[PDB]
Amino acid sequence: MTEKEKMLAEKWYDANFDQTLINERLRAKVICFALNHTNPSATLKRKVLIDALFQTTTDNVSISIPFDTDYGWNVKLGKNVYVNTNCYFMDGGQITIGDNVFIGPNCGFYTATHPLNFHHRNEGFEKAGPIHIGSNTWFGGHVAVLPGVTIGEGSVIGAGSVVTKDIPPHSLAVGNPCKVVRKIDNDL
Amino acid sequence: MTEKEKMLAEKWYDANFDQTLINERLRAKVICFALNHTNPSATLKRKVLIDALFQTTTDNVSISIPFDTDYGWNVKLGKNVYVNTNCYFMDGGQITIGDNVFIGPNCGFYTATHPLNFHHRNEGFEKAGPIHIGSNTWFGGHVAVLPGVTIGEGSVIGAGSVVTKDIPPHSLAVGNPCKVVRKIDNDL
Amino acid sequence: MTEKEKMLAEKWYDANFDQTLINERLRAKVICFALNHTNPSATLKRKVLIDALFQTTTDNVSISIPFDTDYGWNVKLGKNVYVNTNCYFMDGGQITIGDNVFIGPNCGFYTATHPLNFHHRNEGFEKAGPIHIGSNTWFGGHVAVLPGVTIGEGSVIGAGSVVTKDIPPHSLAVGNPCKVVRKIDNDL
Amino acid sequence: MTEKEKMLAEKWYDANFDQTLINERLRAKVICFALNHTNPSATLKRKVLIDALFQTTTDNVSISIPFDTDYGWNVKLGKNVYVNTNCYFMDGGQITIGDNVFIGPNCGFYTATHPLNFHHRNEGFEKAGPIHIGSNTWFGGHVAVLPGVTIGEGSVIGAGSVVTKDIPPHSLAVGNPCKVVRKIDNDL
Amino acid sequence: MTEKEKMLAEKWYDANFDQTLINERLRAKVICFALNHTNPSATLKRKVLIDALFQTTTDNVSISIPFDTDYGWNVKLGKNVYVNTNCYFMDGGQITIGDNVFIGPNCGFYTATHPLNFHHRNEGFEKAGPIHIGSNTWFGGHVAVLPGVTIGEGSVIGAGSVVTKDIPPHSLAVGNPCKVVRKIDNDL
Amino acid sequence: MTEKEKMLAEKWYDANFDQTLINERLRAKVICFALNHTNPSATLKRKVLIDALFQTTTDNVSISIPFDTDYGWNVKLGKNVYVNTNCYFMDGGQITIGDNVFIGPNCGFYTATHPLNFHHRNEGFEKAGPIHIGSNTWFGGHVAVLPGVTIGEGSVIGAGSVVTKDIPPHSLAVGNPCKVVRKIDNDL
Amino acid sequence: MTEKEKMLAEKWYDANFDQTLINERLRAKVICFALNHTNPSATLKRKVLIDALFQTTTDNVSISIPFDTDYGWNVKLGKNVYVNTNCYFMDGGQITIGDNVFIGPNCGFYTATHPLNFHHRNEGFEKAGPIHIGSNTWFGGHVAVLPGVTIGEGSVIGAGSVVTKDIPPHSLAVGNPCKVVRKIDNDL
Amino acid sequence: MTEKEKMLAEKWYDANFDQTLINERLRAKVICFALNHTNPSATLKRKVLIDALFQTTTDNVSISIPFDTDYGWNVKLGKNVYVNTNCYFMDGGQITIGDNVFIGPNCGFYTATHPLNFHHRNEGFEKAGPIHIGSNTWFGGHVAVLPGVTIGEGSVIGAGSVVTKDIPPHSLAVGNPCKVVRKIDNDL
Amino acid sequence: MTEKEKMLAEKWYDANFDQTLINERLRAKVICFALNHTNPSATLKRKVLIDALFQTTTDNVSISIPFDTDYGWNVKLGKNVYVNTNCYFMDGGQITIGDNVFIGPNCGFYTATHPLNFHHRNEGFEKAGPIHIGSNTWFGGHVAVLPGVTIGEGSVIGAGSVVTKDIPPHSLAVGNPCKVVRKIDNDL
Amino acid sequence: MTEKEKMLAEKWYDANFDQTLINERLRAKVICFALNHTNPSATLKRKVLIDALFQTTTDNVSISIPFDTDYGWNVKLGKNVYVNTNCYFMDGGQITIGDNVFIGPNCGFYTATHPLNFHHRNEGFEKAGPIHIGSNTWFGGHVAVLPGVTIGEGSVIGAGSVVTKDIPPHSLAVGNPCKVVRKIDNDL
């Protein structure tokens, strides 16, 4: 297996020293750099860059600059996704985002796990844990989501939350560590 | 009422789809973009841009780049306001800042409330809750202040705090959620 | 004593109004600005800028843009130091980082203490508390480290932690405030 | 009193050598320079610059480049003010312009008086005489308005006029020196 | 009729709010802007721009920058037309210029008439009065020519003149208002 | 004699078609163009350009952009000469300016005479008439000075004046044509 | 149905006046423009642009500039596709290209059919006929392929051919109109 | 006669060495160069350039870049003329194009005839043969039209055709050499 | 033998994967790119680039942009060679061009032969067949010349020709495939 | 004979006023200027420029910027020629350099002789004396080589030498004037 294949299979992979992965990360860094230095009124250029980054034709995916991602193509997006300033989608592990998702400023979605043992970590090994973001969700600013976490559809994450564990659908959750407060009635 | 009028009246308003508001947000994004890409040694240009952003003649308002705001004109500033790197003044709801205020890096002042119900939220409705920052205050880095919050004059907010409720004057407060530790003696 | 000398001696110093310090901070801001606006594929230019910022010849110190520091020369680095996006090394107080250190995105290492009393603080006085980062350490994203803090070699700091007190070697620690969870076995 | 204060009080002030005034004039010159070198199709940038120059949020204030002003913030504007090419608002003395005002090309509104005695003039002293421009007015091209002059609402100033004395409302006036020709019936 | 058609027919037209006219004025402003920011030694580029502005292949039409016109295509030029610095051909009403014409600096040829009644004027109505400039003419600097004026072939207009009425051929005329002084003998 | 020699001798010369003169006019146009497109805060560059234009080391000659001159080297300047926006020193005929001279905006100093007879004028002949500006003088805006005119030391010229004839020293003069009003007492 | 849907269904569609299609064509024109003005040694940037144009992650798709396409996303590419200078993939109708395909310079793949009747054509209607290019094919320079044409795998098209009808697999074909010459033995 | 006059009279002319013609060709090359290097989304600039090239105010003349012409002013265009990529209008001999004309990519309209005898050809002589393109016509890609050719109104020219002889109205014609296939019924 | 040596010896060579050849092709692509993006009025720069491309000091070799070649140094040119727009000299096999040669627009001179068998072709093998162009020749636009072809001195190739076989001297030849029509009398 | 021919024949030639020579010197100055202002890490561009300057395909000719030459094409180079900073090859007279030659910084190779008599020299006459540099040579910094000088293969020239006379092979030579010290044994 290639290191990319191990990454996409939730296996330990040489994230730091594999050349194809370094190249793919460089591609995404370059696109982000371009995007982050494109005047917000250059609507067309921004759209092009976003589409190039995610390698898809986006439908109302609004990215407020700056933005960062590791691969870009490993971020699966729905329609009507609003990303506020300075978010980071660390997508070694696939980041799946549904439709109608509001992401606050300074949010970080982290899929990388390093070994706790420094000997293994120093060799550059990582293990990617996918993040699933349900449709119809809202994240306050300053939220961090850890590897392997699922946030259920219709849920609300309060500002400053550190989401270490799965959040059920239609739930209001806040804190460090993030804990469910109550359920939300999502009906007329 | 226009959507701007509803915003400034603490009423639900169509933040996402109203054209005048979109235009005003674009104006501020452009100014921020210019400022954020102006060499720190270009003192004059920076001063001009800051003044243009806040639509006022500032008196020792130091902004360490990058900086973000939604409207700019809805940030009311005193003299001697020191803003460290990567702050965001989300000012749908007026953000009032007193004199002699120290704002640490990565601070977010959020005035936007979204509906909890995804149906209403998906339509783009928001409600703005003003933030009042007293004079003679100090915020550590990584602080988030939520909508409608008042931080009393002479108070100190510890790094990483998530300010969900009002903080009385001359108080030291820290945590997520931010809680008063003790009162400060602000005398010679 | 000059204000620089007082700063480097853990004494109260006029951080805000001393001209040499203002000049040194401006030097570092300019270098950061250059670096932050250098295309990630311009490997050589980036290396040059990093070396200029830290006033040393770095050995595998990887800085993911953007980056900020106050002085740069007061950041002492080991080899194999990986700094992810949007970190800030507020280095009035020396920041010492060992070898083989992984720093997550949105981390802030803050060495500045301001007086609690607004009268003294408003005059611009600060006191610098050095930060010591042991070799073989890993910081998750969104971590804030406060002045005077030591993080022991071989330790792991969880995402979102606010490190207010010293962390012993070979320890896993998380939270706001950051507390030791368990010890790590760092052996084959 | 500062020299700015003397200027704004219709007193003799050191216009030429006072540093704050020199700085404020430089600010305005820089903004004008930017504006004058902004492509007319860059609608947004132009709007921003105009607003920055006058330190207000303009409402249909159209400025045909080039434009000049001394301070900018001392020009008080109504809505629907149309300024044709190469006008100069010399605003040491406040220039107040009403709503629905048409200003022809090559117009100069001069508020500065110098001493007649060269000894006093050579020292740089000036005295500012405000200009009041009523709403619903029209100026032909090549008009000069002298310090302290009031032009009444609903009035028309013919091309080439040199307005040395006050013009009553609803008047047609022309010449060097500018003299009333007749009254205008401003009714349906 | 379109507003352009009314303009070209000497009828009242909505000069200020008609989109085609706004677009044509913008076209000309852009060309002027380009021309005005083209180095005088870039002979070829200047020639191209002038030709584009007037929508004709000029024959020794020398334009000393800066220059302004409203439409450009409504300026009909002969050969050997020398235009000195900062002239404005306000050409809503056709401006016809003969061969061998010397135009001094700061000259304005104004074809726009506004209503005297502010109610009508505020709606943006104008009426265009063509200007006819005979061949073999010379204008001193600072001359303003009003709407509908004809200046006869072989005539000389003194600096500072305000030409309110028709000037017969082979005449020397000066003043505000411009009056014939004497006839010129234009023979060997 | 060369055409330059005839120009400097008050003789008829081929101003329009002589190559050396065309080249010298082009040199000055280029310098003016550079100056006019130099940011006002670029103090050093501006000083250099002004000095290059006038081919002298100026002493407090302040030029407010834009500025124009035909040759530049034929403008003889004293110290402390303040030139406001959009002036033109048409210097075929030497323009001599004393010390402590205030020149208002939109002033034109014209030394060129053309033949009245179009046959001679069309051939490009001109005759240069020097302008002498005494020390300790003040010109309002919109002033035109004609060829061969002398304005006496200590004199004041009102805005909009068209100076066709010599003005004695210590005189206040205004109008079109410019006429002496009274004498000025220039004593303590 | 939208006009895009009609296009992709081989139905008559308003190619010329539909806004979404105009926008998609503009997107592709912009990307091509960028690519065509990117230095050939900027390997990374070129790769990014190509991928953005075709909305896929290409595998050894080499594009020799200049290049043109109408939509880009309607070009389906295999691996190892070599496109020489100045090709045009007019892709209203899907253009499917296999693996190991050599495309000579100045080739045009045209999928658009216009009505023969000028009345219908003038309204902007078109009908898209897909082009299928088999794997292991080679096109000489100056080849035009018409709408709806299939070129079989392993086939060779001679320079200058005008391919009006389907070409069977493993065939050598040349001419205007393109006709099969012989079959190719594609074995060791 | 000038060489331009001989060109426009269908006479042999010194196309290669005449300076006025070289200059006119250079003018057009420069405009084409500008146009060809203008971003397709710069609608206004493109319109300006096209109009400058053809020395007319175009009505829905769409030029897909790149484009080339020899003189530009010798291309007479109707309204609604659609020119696809990389066309060349070699217009020594007038090229007249009607209304509602569709021109495919890579088309060349050649009006230049060279002498067959190399001695005469080497001297640079050419003879221009006008091309007439009827209204309501459609050209496929890769078409070449030779000097003196007339293509009748309502006709369709197949891709790759080499039009050596006149094509009657309402005709479908294809081939090298281009021959009529059938007549087109251009009725409802 | 190196792959370059095999290429220059008419042997099968690894055109696609040999690094020296890839580098030489990249050199030429870069020069072409520079040339193709050099303003036609930059005579000197163009001359320099052409000379650099062909690695010779050209004598009246006029290249109308754009232009392409594979190596450049393998194009041997005589004096007075006129190359119109968008030509491609695919020079793996030497392209020898005599004196006084007129090359029309969109001409392609192709020296590369690929294997017919896809297995061999897919490996990147090619065989170069030199093209010889006699002196005193003229090519119409849209001509393609195939590998190994010789076109005799004094010959004329009609527009759209596909030259598959050798053309004798002093011949008029046209068509696809190109066939001799008649001989030319090249005498006075 | 042309002046170039006289130059290349060791005859007196009008170096200063001959137009072809002035043009050739300008070509080389332009290339040097480009090279001298090309970033040293732009390996490809530098190689291209060097090759263009010397009009040859160099083999390991390393030029450390800045560099100067008069013609460039009159410098004949071997392989492995290392030129350190700020050298000048004044090549009116051919400069022949062998293989494996080390040239120190600030070296000047001067082939121009001027007449001693100022009358002849002032007319611009020069006589070119070729310089021959043997293979396997080494020049220290600050060396000047005079016209007509031959430096034998295997020789070493000490820093600061002024080489007025021929140096035999395998010799160590130093001084002003340069004199042989000893012979070098160039064997294993």
Curated annotation (Swiss-Prot), chains A, B, C, D, E, F, G, H, I, J:
CDD domains: LbH_MAT_GAT (cd03357). It holds the Pfam family Hexapep. GO terms for molecular function: galactoside O-acetyltransferase activity. The keyword Transferase applies. The keyword Repeat applies. Its EC number is 2.3.1.-. Keywords: Acyltransferase, Repeat, Transferase. InterPro entries: Hexapep, LacA-like, Mac_dom, Trimer_LpxA-like_sf. Belongs to the transferase hexapeptide repeat family. This is Putative acetyltransferase SACOL2570. It comes from Staphylococcus aureus (strain COL).
